[PDB]
Symmetry: D2
Subunit: 467 residues, 4 copies
Amino acid sequence: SDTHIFIIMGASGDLAKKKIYPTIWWLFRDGLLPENTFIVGYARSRLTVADIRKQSEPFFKATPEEKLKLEDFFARNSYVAGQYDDAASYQRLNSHMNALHLGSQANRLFYLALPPTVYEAVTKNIHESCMSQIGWNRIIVEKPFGRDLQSSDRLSNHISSLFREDQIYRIDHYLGKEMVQNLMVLRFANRIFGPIWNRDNIACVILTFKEPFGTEGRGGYFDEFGIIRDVMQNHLLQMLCLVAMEKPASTNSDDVRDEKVKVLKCISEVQANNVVLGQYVGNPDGEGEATKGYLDDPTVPRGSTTATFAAVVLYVENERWDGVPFILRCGKALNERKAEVRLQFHDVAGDIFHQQCKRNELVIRVQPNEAVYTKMMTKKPGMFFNPEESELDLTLPDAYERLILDVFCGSQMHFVRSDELREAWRIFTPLLHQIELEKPKPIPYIYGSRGPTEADELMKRVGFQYE
Amino acid sequence: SDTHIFIIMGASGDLAKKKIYPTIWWLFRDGLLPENTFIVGYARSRLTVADIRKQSEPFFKATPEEKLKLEDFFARNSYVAGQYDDAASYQRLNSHMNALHLGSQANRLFYLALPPTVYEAVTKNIHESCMSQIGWNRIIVEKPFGRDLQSSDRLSNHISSLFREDQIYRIDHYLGKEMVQNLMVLRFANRIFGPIWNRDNIACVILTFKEPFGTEGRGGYFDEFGIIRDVMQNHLLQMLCLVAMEKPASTNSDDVRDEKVKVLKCISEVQANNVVLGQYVGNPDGEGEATKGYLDDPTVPRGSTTATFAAVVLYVENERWDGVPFILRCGKALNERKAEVRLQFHDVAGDIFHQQCKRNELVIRVQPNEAVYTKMMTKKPGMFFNPEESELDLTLPDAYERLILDVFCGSQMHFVRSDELREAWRIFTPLLHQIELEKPKPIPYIYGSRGPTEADELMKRVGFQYE
Amino acid sequence: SDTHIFIIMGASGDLAKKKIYPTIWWLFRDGLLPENTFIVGYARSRLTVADIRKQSEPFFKATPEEKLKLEDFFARNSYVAGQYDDAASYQRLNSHMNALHLGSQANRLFYLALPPTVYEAVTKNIHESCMSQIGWNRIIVEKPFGRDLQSSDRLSNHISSLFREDQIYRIDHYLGKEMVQNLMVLRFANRIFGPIWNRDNIACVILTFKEPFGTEGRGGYFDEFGIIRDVMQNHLLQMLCLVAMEKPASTNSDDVRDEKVKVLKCISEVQANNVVLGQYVGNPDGEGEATKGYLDDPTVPRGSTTATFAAVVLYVENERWDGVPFILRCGKALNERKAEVRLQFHDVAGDIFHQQCKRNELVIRVQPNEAVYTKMMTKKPGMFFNPEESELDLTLPDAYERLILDVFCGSQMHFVRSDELREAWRIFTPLLHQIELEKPKPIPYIYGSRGPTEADELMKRVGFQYE
Amino acid sequence: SDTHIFIIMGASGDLAKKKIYPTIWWLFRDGLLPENTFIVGYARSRLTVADIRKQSEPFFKATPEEKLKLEDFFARNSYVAGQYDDAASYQRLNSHMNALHLGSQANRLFYLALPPTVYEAVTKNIHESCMSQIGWNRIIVEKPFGRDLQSSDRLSNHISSLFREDQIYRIDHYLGKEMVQNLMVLRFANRIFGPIWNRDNIACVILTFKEPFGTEGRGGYFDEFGIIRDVMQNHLLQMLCLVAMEKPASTNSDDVRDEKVKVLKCISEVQANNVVLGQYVGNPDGEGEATKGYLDDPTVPRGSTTATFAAVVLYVENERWDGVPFILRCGKALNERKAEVRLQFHDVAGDIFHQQCKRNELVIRVQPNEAVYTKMMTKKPGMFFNPEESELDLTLPDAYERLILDVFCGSQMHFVRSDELREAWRIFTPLLHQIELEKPKPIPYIYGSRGPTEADELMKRVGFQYE
């Protein structure tokens, strides 16, 4: 009902032209955005709505059946050209927004789709210039959230001195939000999985994020950060919080993020003896990009110690998870594209089936195909007592569209908080400093393989049983 | 490899010609019996193998493809005519076995398919004359096992003074042996269902055995015993033992029957305030037998207070099942054929889903259409935290063939023991004495219904939350 | 070192001269305060240090041995005469504080011991002038913290707009801090009482606070608040939070108050059917004040429905405490002085001792005679299996001295938080509004009795088994 | 009434005159024996009541006050001289017993206090001649119950072919029967110790039986058996059964021995890698027998590897005790006399006390100075959250008198059964056969020390945390 404005900061950027504009396109096409919604593209380069349309339509996946809808979408679009650290551009932007249908009363939604080196300046100018005095104001902040505990604290302190937590929306591109809700309903609305969700029954927790592609083209951008900062400290650790949390007081966003930050407070700093780092190398038997390793990219500096694979074992030190390993295994250039939560349960206390029993498993897969199945054992049909391992299944805008829909709706549950981010960086900062100080050489693994075998050895050591 | 003999006592009886000969037919046809197996029918009236063929073939369900195999099977059988209480006849039958290929060294298997009023004489004569000195001897005792604690005690004392527990096989026609193994493997090989199998999680247990037909023709025989002795005293109580048993020390038959009798030893005597007794009456809407009531059968004595339906709540007072109701609901002429084990779980402690969750259920249906499925809630596809109830499935000679194969193989796990049988009557004897002493009037219910609503009121009172 | 200043707001009040001067005197006498500490009294009446001496010496309970040390303590005292709502008075008080040894660098602590209506002006004036620019500043706020959710929210919002939670110290005079630490260590450092601290084992929780004396003198002031607001809203509910809290992430003050707030957030509003209200009436026999009832006090308004006793059942609707009653029983003019936490455990699952077992209890008595004892069953010596009830013991400035020491050391664990207080008032606000709207008549009970019988009936109804 | 006869088989032996006659003295002196109790000594040497008096009075420990009652006890006694393998002597004994006041109607109770090589003939002669046709018959059998599985099965099969389990009373001199009942009431009547009695909480179980003296003169008798067959196979393993048993269906003896044998069936055979065997050596610094080693005894054969100390770790592979070690530590000539049960509990999940908490323990000391106490952490009084470990106590004929009283009363709970003994010998037979075949050398330890250090290393290896 209320009129809204979708503000794309740095709309000329690659991310804005490939993932955000198509994602508001698909959201307006499906009728999910509020009826009165305006898109204002703001960047440094002087462009028009026609230029943005021309440069973004290939990624729109447009069809001839909806050219009228496409024209309606682009009639709601607007562009303002200005520097990110020049105030005059910001009051020009604010005057443009006020020069709209109920622009002053409109709810303003900022998306910061620009390099993080200017987040300070952009947030400083937005607070003084482009706020709305009637409707709410919300900024979407993209990763990276700094690289250390100190930098993350300084950016978070700046933003929280300007905004409040109700206005900060730190987005996580890899959070499905549907399998997360499946997790919460499964382990919180069912008594089957309630009492068994603790130390006494679960042996280990494996949180996986594999990508079959390396760092083609954009290897220099990945070099400065590494796979830990890329995936593990934010996405896999948020999945750890969702898996290991206590039952919240309610399904409110704050009541869930409190449980997540409480789980984070129980995790101690990472020790390097529980970390296996890998770096993919070219495959001689490959066909395309498989024949080029991480160091083969001309944008990667020579002798780069950046790891494209990492397996890290964490321990949530509370009553429910003390001593249970949490193996965060993520890496690039692996054999498949997988992202799942895997729980191995303990062997049954007292075996009457002559060591034929296997550990029960509960897998919550997000990528490529969503599934929730339990690998438990049922009796093999016949005339004889032996269990057999059987896979039993227990289970549409994608993750990004629904995340933007949460930002519109104000559901901040699936976004990392400030204290949550501080604990997430506290867990990993000493290990990252040690890695970037000593520069230990990562274990090379072949492109398309399963990663270094030392990661498998570490998983064996911590108490993981693989068939 | 070793030769076997299958002795059918009372082969001229209805039970033999209707259930036994087809069952051994299906066991021999499927190539499951030992190759050297002899069948020796014995009854009072003078018959031959040809007479048995003429009276039995329509119930064989044979096909023209296997008429040669049928001829081979009937060239293997034999008949002996003699009284059940004459030593000379038993000596003749023993000689008849001795006049067979390796007959003296054969394993002898006696099935008691004759009225229980003469078991006292028949077992005595069998022990006196027909016993085997080399091969094992096994007798299969058909229900009824007496009418109360005293009659069952005297019969069991006689049989155990003659034979040992390794030789007694008290058969349960309604026991699947397929879903029982599924139960044991499900709850004993899986940690998913291990910790939750107790008071803290399971709210109530429903053990159901319904039949869509009444007591046509043979209602007079049912009159003297009633539905309690007919189904509930033995079959439903064995199912209760299998559900409530502790994990045995091994998969041995004795190690399982010890747990069964231990479970029976902690069930108090049945009180009349936990029992709902009903009698099916005609459904004037008719259709067939439905328009004839229990008392409308001329074979039933006038003014018969025999209950064709019974709902009884039992409490296994031990550390695992204290306070958890065990509702045995069995009846005749009900709405459908069903035999299932249903476990309601408690509501989740602390509801963050606005009273939308329902009690989880684990259902182990024995017949028809064997299945093991849990009613647990998944996330409703959509946009919000909405739980919806979903049925998730977790799952070949019939039961009688697999039970006769148990007697052949010596597996005595699914047969009731003497101490187990004595505990079964100590739980039901006071109630039955009260019923046939005071002679209460059962609540009449229409043919084809779900039973008297007083049973539903009883289940609701004891803690069964029916949605 | 690090010189301190202890500013006692309201130096002429009864609370000051009767409890605060003795407490700080005992703190210095025991050598517990920092060596450099100054006590600056401030009130409206023109007084001196000698007037403070003459008005407060009866209550120091001093001895002639330490009269020199008493003189030393009074040599560190001072008085400032100024109105509570005069800016010049606070300016001269700030100048007086600066006119001390290392005064500007001193840590300032203001004890607000003045009537509730004046906090609004006093906090504002203190924040305007009397703040310290170098050392820390802390305020100690005496109850009442408003009369309902609205008044408490107003006062808390004012104070939080002025001060931060690190500076607000809401004092609870009834909180032992010695048996509370014993409770936390007992239930968090021991595996004996760890697993059993949940629904599955605990039947009901009784939190008790009884006084043997009535409302002599201070009767009209008690009239406007009632026993609920006086004791149950703050002290008994904090005891409930301590009993029902999960294990905090650490022993830090914030980590404990977070668990306390999470416990409070899981408690629904109090219903009038779970409340029993009593009002003590004069015991005809008596000896003294027992002859005088609540309305017999001339200062109590006629026809007062104020309850001097209250029994309230609370339910913490979370995973650990769903369905477990929390019976808060507080009252005045009862049979004995008592303040204890009593935990009844369930009956043992399966009784093999012929119903001779009583429910196990864990009692943590705070006053009188601080003790921790559990009532479990031990075998009666002899030749028989006859268990018998046995009491087994499981277990220094007073509570107020250690509470002021907490404010000096900054240990804010034992002080209620703004959100904690908001939740506490949210729980009780509808019930109190109904009480002072409908004006129910409390059940009159004899002075020196155990309270109205309806409280015992309520405990019996909710599941309390009294031997 | 119901006249009783106490037959001491082999009354001329050391065991009778040193332990049994004083025990019946103390039983009749305290008025615990039935009033019509006759004592009949029977052995080879031609003796009289006066001679038994002369040889046994020094061990009677009587007083001149009760010297009058002494004759009354000796006025009920009688003696028969006969060989143990002569039917004429046993017929004479039967006639002598029949030549008593209501001797034919009397209850006959035989004590077998004669060498085990003669038991086979003695039991046969008793069953042939001396059995009672009216009252009950009970035989008390002394250890050893054979040397291994084969001999024990032979003896038990012989006795069971002669007598039934209601007549066989296998005595255990070291079973207190007083602290065992305390343990049962503690863990079965209380929920404080109920849910914590499993894998999830208990880390290890230590079963101790120490003696400060070595083989004094009877080293030759101990040489053929060893400390395993001496104490560990029978007494410590019965303690293991009592600790690890599930809650019986009742307090009946049969229901308890059923659980004991069920626990025994869940114990795998002992492996030599979980066994530490020791042999004590003389201590130069000693004064008396401490200076003489095991091999220094002339009655001990030269080059004897008989173990006088043994530390053995067992595992009860069932649902409640999977992976929990059961360390049986017994030895002779140790530092102190002790026989206790110690249960170490796991570390609390999540330490908020900075690695200060120690594992909770529950100690049930049987001898000396019977006591039950828990070592659990309570807060150290002061100004800090630091717990301290404290010992909190949870707590008359001696053990042998109460055991004979159990035999008289028919309480068979504390006597080992046939199948119990079968499982007990099955557990230890492979290890003992390996010991007697390979003949390993035990680790020498100093007389009066704590035992070999390898035992401590084994306890630390299996999971025992020593402070």
